[PDB]
């Protein structure tokens, strides 16, 4: 609806787009159309206080890429085309047989305007991603509709998201995207690689046919003349030619195993016209010349109906991240002998070398093609290449030399009432306050005023450094790292990279070393007994001997009276100790945290209440400043009978010392007797009652576990739907314990590493919903609280307010033979019940809704 000015124009383009969508709806598999205003080269020798500029002009006579064919068409001087398609000259080399070359020109002319699809081409890539050519070769093949799979030399989180952007950015209607790490060298692996890409789905997967191939190489190998045939450059000389030669044969050997041999496969080969031509190259040149044996080899060696060779001479392209010497001149080359192509989108032409009307011609014959933009028409490339820079590097320098001596010369001479709202909310999750993670759901960055909140927690800063008495004189900043690095540690420009990742990469896995209380998880203390017959006579301290005597009866271990001492010891064949055993646990390391929990909180309550109860205790104050209402005594100035109050705290665990009561008691570790009050599930709210705001009104406390803390809202909102109570407070926390895991995953739910390691290492990931790699969700320690008010006292002297209450659970109405069974219609189908007796017209009980 038109109230926003943009919205009308938005609506204008919408129907414009919608029609463009509707017209092309269910059409072909889109384009290859890289409609970006292609530039050229922009070198600019700055006169004054700067040197060489960079690049990216705008290119005169271009704009649309339609022109970019035509510009690349009629090349300069004695030329056929800038990029040509030659032929093996029936006696000689690669003469520009313009006959067949016309079609490639035409196919390029067929591009831009007409969309260029590539649906169902079955392609595979060796070369890199973000660095160079293949990403362009990737991208158009996505919008070509092609079924594509890709390798990578590296393997990281940094590359995994990288392609994950692109399939969400360029993957068309029918394209398929799957990645895999792959070392090009160490040639044994490609047999497993060629396995997996022709394997049936009852094997590793990907039942494809692989009908095009691009093997783009690596390893720059710079600055080496002839007499050095040295190390891994030699190994690099293998991986430019040997393995890729050993690649394409077993493709056919896999293909002719099935015998689908009247459907061939493309191979496009990166050729180089400049061999014996550049400088400190080493093995790179004559390795590139090795590819040309295939032209004779494609005839007369029985694989021609399977492999479709069409090489690519391409070179001298900017867009330098790697492999591109001279990110500098690009312009005198297009001036002295004006010949073209110092650009970045040569691969656009290479996409045209994977289309029909061409590959069918490649089914006829291999295609040598001088795609290189007339660069061979330069006599003496290399020294003239040096000659351009050596003039340019001095003139930049000598002007940069002019101003400094000018500056050297210059410097010297001078001197209602039942609908209820939420009012203060606060959770302590894995990260910091709820205000911290609300940025962390928004961004990855921590918003420096918010980032120091992450440093106020975890004990990282040392705020309240004395308003007086800083570093030797006065002056003060909220300090950090108690007394090495107290130097002024500011909430402005500082705290970046000095409180970062070491301060950030502690809250995600390895779960700790030594927190709960130790819980190594690399070794789990699992214990076995034994009953051999050595006999020892150790030493004791008295009154242990009687429970020694009571446990194993007098036919074993007659103790003795150990005269002038306490007693004496072991007798017979002992039937004990349950010593220990080094055992390995697989499942672990989902959560972590906070590394410090003592805010301004009263000590010696942390001797007693301890384990999980700190987290709720800080939380409710954290919700009260989220309410903006400290001093909870000052609620009763809205004078009541004070009969309203307490929360409905919940959680399955909290065991945390019951393991002390069960494992450590009966193994005698000194734990307080008063732990039985702290065993139960409501005693959290009791210190929310007693050593906090202290009305003795309503308390409910359900369990709701494995999906908990939503339920206490509903029973809490029932209490204010009832007149039995006004203002209330919610349930909350889960918690994590060492007996929790392993007895987690034995029920086979939560997660399991190693198959989380071994699939994609990525320990910060750990959560893959709905892109079909789920392993359960996760587990966290967690603590969370929301408070709610009567909407009227919430109005009258405003708390303030957040939002709107929504739902109502708990009518299960189901039985089976399973626990747990997920939420099917067992829940939330009585929600939106809506029995549908015959209405055909709209307008507590309500059989309609």
């Amino acid at each position: 609806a038109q109230a926003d000015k943009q919205d009308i124009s938005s609506s204008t383009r919408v129907e414009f787009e919608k029609l463009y969508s509707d017209l092309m709806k269910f059409l072909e598999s889109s384009k290859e159309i890289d409609p970006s205003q292609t530039t050229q080269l922009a070198g600019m020798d700055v006169e004054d206080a700067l040197d060489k500029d960079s690049t990216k002009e705008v290119a005169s006579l271009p704009n649309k890429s339609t022109i970019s064919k035509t510009v690349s068409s009629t090349i300069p001087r004695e030329t056929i085309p800038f990029l040509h398609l030659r032929k093996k000259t029936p006696a000689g080399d690669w003469k520009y047989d313009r006959q067949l070359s016309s079609l490639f020109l035409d196919g390029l002319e067929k591009a831009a305007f007409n969309g260029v699809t590539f649906k169902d081409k079955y392609v595979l890539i060796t070369g890199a991603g973000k660095g160079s050519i293949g990403a362009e070769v990737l991208q158009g093949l996505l919008q070509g509709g092609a079924k594509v799979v890709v390798t990578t030399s590296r393997f990281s989180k940094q590359v995994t998201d990288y392609y994950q952007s692109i399939y969400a950015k360029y993957g068309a209607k029918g394209s398929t995207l799957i990645v895999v790490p792959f070392n090009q060298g160490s040639k044994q692996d490609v047999e497993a690689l060629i396995e997996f890409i022709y394997d049936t789905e009852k094997n590793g997967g990907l039942g494809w046919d692989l009908d095009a191939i691009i093997p783009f190489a690596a390893i720059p190998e710079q600055g080496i003349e002839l007499e050095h045939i040295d190390s891994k450059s030699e190994f690099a000389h293998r991986i430019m030619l040997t393995n890729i030669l050993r690649m394409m044969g077993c493709v056919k050997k896999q293909k002719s195993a099935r015998g689908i041999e009247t459907r061939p496969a493309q191979v496009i080969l990166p050729m180089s016209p400049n061999h014996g031509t550049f400088g400190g190259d080493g093995m790179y040149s004559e390795s590139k010349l090795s590819l040309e044996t295939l032209f004779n080899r494609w005839h007369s060696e029985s694989w021609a109906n399977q492999l479709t060779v069409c090489g690519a001479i391409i070179g001298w392209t900017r867009g330098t991240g790697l492999m591109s010497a001279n990110n500098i001149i690009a312009e005198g080359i297009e001036k002295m002998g004006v010949r073209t192509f110092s650009q970045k989108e040569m691969a656009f032409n290479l996409l045209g070398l994977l289309t029909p009307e061409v590959v069918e011609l490649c089914q006829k014959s291999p295609v040598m093609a001088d795609l290189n933009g007339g660069l061979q028409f330069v006599p003496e490339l290399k020294e003239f290449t040096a000659k351009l820079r050596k003039e340019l590097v001095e003139t930049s320098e000598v002007r940069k030399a002019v101003s400094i001596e000018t500056a050297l010369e210059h410097k010297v001479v001078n001197g209602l009432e039942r609908v209820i709202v939420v009012t203060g909310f606060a959770e302590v999750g894995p990260w910091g306050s709820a205000r911290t993670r609300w940025e962390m759901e928004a961004f990855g960055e921590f918003s420096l005023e918010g980032c120091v909140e992450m440093a106020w927690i975890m004990g990282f800063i040392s705020y309240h450094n004395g308003n007086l008495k800083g570093r030797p004189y006065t002056g003060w900043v909220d300090s950090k790292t108690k007394e090495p690095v107290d130097d002024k540690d500011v909430k402005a420009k500082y705290e970046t990279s000095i409180l970062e990742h070491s301060g950030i990469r502690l809250i995600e896995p390895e779960l700790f070393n030594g927190y709960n209380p130790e819980k190594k998880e690399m070794i789990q203390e699992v214990i076995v007994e034994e009953d051999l017959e050595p006999f020892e006579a150790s030493k004791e301290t008295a009154e242990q001997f009687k429970h020694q005597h009571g446990d194993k009866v007098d036919i074993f271990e007659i103790p003795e009276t150990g005269e002038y001492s306490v007693k004496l010891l072991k007798g017979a064949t002992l039937y004990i100790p349950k010593a220990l055993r080094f055992d390995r646990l697989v499942a672990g390391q989902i959560p972590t945290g906070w590394n410090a929990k003592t805010y301004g909180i009263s000590d010696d309550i942390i001797s007693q209440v301890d384990p999980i109860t700190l987290f709720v205790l800080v939380s409710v104050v954290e919700a009260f400043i989220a309410s903006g209402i400290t001093d909870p005594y000052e609620m009763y100035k809205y004078v009541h009978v004070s009969e309203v109050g307490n929360c409905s705290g919940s959680g399955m665990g909290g065991v945390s010392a019951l393991r002390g009561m069960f494992k450590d008691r009966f193994k005698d570790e000194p734990v307080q007797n008063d732990i039985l009050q702290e065993s139960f599930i409501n005693t959290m709210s009791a210190w929310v009652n007693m050593l906090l705001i202290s009305s003795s009104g309503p308390i409910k406390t359900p369990v709701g576990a494995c999906a908990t803390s939503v339920e206490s809202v509903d029973i809490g909102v029932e209490t204010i739907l009832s007149g039995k109570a006004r203002i209330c407070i919610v349930g909350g926390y889960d918690d994590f314990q060492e007996e929790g895991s392993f007895e987690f995953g034995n029920m086979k739910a939560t997660s399991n590493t190693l198959e989380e390691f071994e699939h994609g290492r990525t320990p910060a990931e750990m959560s893959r919903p709905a892109t079909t790699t789920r392993n359960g969700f996760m587990e966290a320690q967690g603590a969370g609280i929301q408070i709610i008010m009567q909407a009227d006292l919430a109005l009258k002297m405003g708390v303030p307010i957040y939002g709107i209450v929504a739902m109502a659970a708990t009518a299960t109405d189901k039985i089976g033979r399973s626990v747990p069974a997920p939420g099917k219609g067992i829940l939330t189908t009585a929600r939106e019940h809506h029995s549908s007796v015959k209405y055909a017209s709209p307008n507590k009980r309500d059989p309609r809704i």
Binding site: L416, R418, V419, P842, N843, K844, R845, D846, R848, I849
Partner: protein, 71 residues
């Protein structure tokens, strides 16, 4: 009915409960004095400030439904 209706909120109740505010004023207006004039304001401040509660009880009771319990 699920649209934010308010019409039947205003028509049946919010007129009928507004019918006997003046007619509930009339319900006192048969006992106008009748031996008040010594107990007039006790006859005023007891009945009038308790029939306001009945209207107020009927106010939220009508507004039980029509939105707060529309379903």
């Amino acid at each position: 009915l699920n649209m934010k209706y308010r019409k039947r909120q205003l028509v049946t109740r919010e007129a009928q409960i507004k019918d006997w505010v003046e007619n509930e004023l009339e319900a006192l207006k048969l006992e106008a004095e009748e031996i008040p004039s010594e107990d007039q304001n006790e006859f005023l401040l007891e009945r009038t400030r308790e029939i306001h509660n009945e209207a107020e009880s009927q106010l939220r009771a009508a507004q039980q439904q029509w939105g707060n319990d529309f379903y």
